[PDB]
Amino acid sequence: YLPSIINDVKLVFDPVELSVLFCKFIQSIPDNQLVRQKLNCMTKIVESTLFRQSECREVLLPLLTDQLSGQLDDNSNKPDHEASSQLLSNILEVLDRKDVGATAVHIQLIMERLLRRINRTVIGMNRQSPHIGSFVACMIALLQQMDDSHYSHYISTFKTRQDIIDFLMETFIMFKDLIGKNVYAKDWMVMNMTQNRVFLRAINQFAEVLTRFFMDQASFELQLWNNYFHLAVAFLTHESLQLETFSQAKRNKIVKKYGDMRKEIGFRIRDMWYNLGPHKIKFIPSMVGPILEVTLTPEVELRKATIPIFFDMMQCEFNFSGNGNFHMFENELITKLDQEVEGGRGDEQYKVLLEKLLLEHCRKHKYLSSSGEVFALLVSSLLENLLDYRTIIMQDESKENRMSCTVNVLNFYKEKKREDIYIRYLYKLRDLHRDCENYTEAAYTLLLHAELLQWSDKPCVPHLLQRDSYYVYTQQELKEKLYQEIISYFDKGKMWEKAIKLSKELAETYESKVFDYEGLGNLLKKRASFYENIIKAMRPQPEYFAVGYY
Amino acid sequence: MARWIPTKRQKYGVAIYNYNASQDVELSLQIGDTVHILEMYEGWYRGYTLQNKSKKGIFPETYIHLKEATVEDLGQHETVIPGELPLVQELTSTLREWAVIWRKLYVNNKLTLFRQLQQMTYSLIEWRSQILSGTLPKDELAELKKKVTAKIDHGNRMLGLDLVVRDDNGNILDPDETSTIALFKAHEVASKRIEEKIQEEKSILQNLDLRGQSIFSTIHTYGLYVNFKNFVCNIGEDAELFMALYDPDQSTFISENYLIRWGSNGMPK
Amino acid sequence: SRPILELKEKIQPEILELIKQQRLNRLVEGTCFRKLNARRRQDKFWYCRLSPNHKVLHYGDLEESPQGEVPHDSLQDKLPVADIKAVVTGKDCPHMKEKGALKQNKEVLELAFSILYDSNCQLNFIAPDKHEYCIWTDGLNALLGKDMMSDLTRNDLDTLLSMEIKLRLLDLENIQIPDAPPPIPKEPSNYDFVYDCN
């Protein structure tokens, strides 16, 4: 109730004397009494009598900051979470008010006494279920209200560079954990857009700080760009054309109110990458892939701006081509490109545009650009292959055509000899055939996989080390597992001749390389069963037809 | 045909009926074809239509229902009442999306929500018509604004659509990035309305007492209407009828006695 | 509403094709249809699923499935959509005229429909009620490429046409459509647009 008096008391009393008297009252409270109550009290303070600020704001706040900073981390912040959120929200709300009074300098004071605090808080206040959204709203409001001058004033000019580096990396990984795992119900489109705009602002500011204190200027400790581009791309990985399209105004509404944020995201990242300069090569292979998907964005303009970066990075290798060429780059390019395209992302115009830009760039340049030209022709062939594959897949929805086209791409990769993706679609086909219960064909495909292996011990490449389970798996052991599986398939495939055939080499391997006679016994048991099956029962013959397509 | 002049005082390019297709860029221009004309001829107007915002159409001045007004009705003072017209345009766009989802619905077995959509659609369109005129009192304006906002937000809900804020004055002020925290408060209030309506779907669409409780908690004064029809009593003399509210448990009356004079002829005196 | 009615029924076909496409969807999702005289351990319920391509019908003596259509190769996965003479409805079904063991009672007079194929084979089936009977006949006639025969179909036509048109008269609000259309102002013969095109 004491705050209830403050209005008319000020109406008949000094402003600042009132301010200091209430401050003295409050600070006199022992540190462990009625904390929520004092928070409500200071709220009932701030919402009023702060419409005028010049004489009180600067003196009222310091105490308020003291309480909230004690509320930062005392291991007992659990009850006052929502109350502190209320305090922070209301004070920032009042601050953003225009008529109330100039506060940009006071904004700076709040920034300096609040920013690391609240960031640390929401870092610790990390669970999605609680009223996290309130804190997030508070801090994004803070970001919106601040200024680039503010941003760079002290937060960019901290103590030892190590501390500011830690702060920056914490902030970046946090933004990643926010964009990923969004905090709202996905219906608060206004909120998401506002959050995106303020995050644009913040990440821009932290881009200039990276440039001005972490270029070759900081000749060392130049890793964080990995996190930075990761965060940027993840932010660049939503809010796309179709979502913009649902209502015809949706494109229009968003663009008029926000524009294509993705456009400036892409251009900022493009110029930043250009700014990397000499560090580009030390930075290419990890982030090759992270560029395709943004290049794969369904727009036109930033795509036009973005494919040229591919020539830029192959050229960066061309500088580094003293040891070989961009083979490491293009391998990753092929692989990634495969995953995203088969994910159902690209377009034909995309492939045309890629060919145009890369050819144009390579004309100006040397022999290695001719190699890039022929490999771009290769890439275009790959792209058209995948596009035909996907259009048939989502067009016909008949497993037959699916198998046909996946065999086509399998043969294409075998022609291109890129073995790993070949294995990937081989396993895809195995899944398909099992779905069809075509045990024999699944067995054959899985055999083609197994055929690549050897009875040696050293696992030569992790390419054969697939995604099903990933640990040592000596080629010997994996080959054993595959042979067991194929034997089972043939067994239920009712084709025991091949079963016995493979059983023979498997027994050979057991008895001459691993000497596990238990395996011998089980395998021979199965082989005897096979011979019994051959001799005893009978099997129908499948009719064979000729099909002439014309 | 010649002499076209760029202007933005012809936003409301309004037809009369299905236009003739005499122009290579004109067709049976539908009744509801508001067209963003870019160029003025004295007798003709050519520019973007609502149906195609990338194609022109030369449409007669006599056929055009000329309206110098633009999307903003305060610069030229076109509002029948300021602060209400934004609501009608937004609800018209809402009706457009209702039509789209409508096409999307019959093809599916969602006929229950489809029919409830029909009835909310009737309610919304009749409210649209009745608020086209500013004849209603200001309290009526506020009440319509509130209830139609609730209805449209609900419609966005079960259709899985985004939300809006700024209950009054066209629902646009807060989405004008005026603040951030108050925006969060508005969004949270919108979610409050949403949770109200999701819990009350099963409360009104099924039950009829929870709505009464919610309505009667908001007000305090009530009046019981009694409409006497005829008195049947074998008296033969003049009768006085003292009907009033009574508390049998408390053995006392609740309302003051209302007196009726009844004649001896079977009819009230 | 004379200009209104002219403009309304004159732009008809969109609702028509939408209705028929929905009917095709309904046939595709289908249901477990009803046979003739499936009393003694004969599966009265059995699905007849139209191809997503809408060229073949997956149907046959399927089991008593209360969930309805099951996706697999039915007893016969073909019904030749290219040669069906017609479907007989009501008394025209010979099995209604059956006076022996397959006497379909007078309570299935409106539930009788038989597909005419092979010029000698018929598919004498029953509907669970009138509305889906008319719906299936609608879908078949859509395959036949002719008009619809559901009262609910006319209901849908009128209601949705009214909805669409009622949405269109918003631009002409407070304005009227002269039932005699306004005279066309004369267009100058020259096409020399002084200002640029587009």
Numbering used by the authors:
A (entry chain E): 819 to 1368
B (entry chain E): 1 to 269
C (entry chain D): 530 to 727
Original paper wording:
The dedicator of cytokinesis (DOCK)/engulfment and cell motility (ELMO) complex serves as a guanine nucleotide exchange factor (GEF) for the GTPase Rac. RhoG, another GTPase, activates the ELMO-DOCK-Rac pathway during engulfment and migration. The DOCK-A (DOCK1/2/5) and DOCK-B (DOCK3/4) subfamilies specifically activate Rac and have an Src homology domain at their N-terminus; the Src homology domain is involved in autoinhibition and binding to engulfment and cell motility (ELMO) scaffold proteins. ELMO is structurally divided into two domains: an N-terminal domain (NTD), consisting of the Ras-binding (RBD), ELMO inhibitory (EID), and ELMO domains, and a C-terminal domain (CTD), consisting of the Pleckstrin homology (PH) domain and proline-rich region.
We performed 3D variability analysis using the 3.8 Å-resolution consensus map of RhoG/DOCK5/ELMO1/Rac1. This analysis revealed several continuous movements within individual protomers of the DOCK5/ELMO1CTD/Rac1 core region. Next, to capture representative conformations of the DOCK5/ELMO1CTD/Rac1 core region, we divided the RhoG/DOCK5/ELMO1/Rac1 consensus map into 10 classes by 3D classification. Five classes of sufficient quality were obtained with resolutions ranging from 4.2 to 4.5 Å and subjected to atomic model building and refinement. The resulting structures of classes 1 to 5 differed from one another in dimeric molecular dimensions. Structural differences were due to the conformational changes between the armadillo repeat domain and DHR-2 in DOCK5, accompanied by a shift in the PH domain of ELMO1. Consistent with this theory, our cryo-EM single particle analysis reveals that the DOCK5/ELMO1CTD/Rac1 core region is highly flexible and can, therefore, readily transition to a flatter conformation.
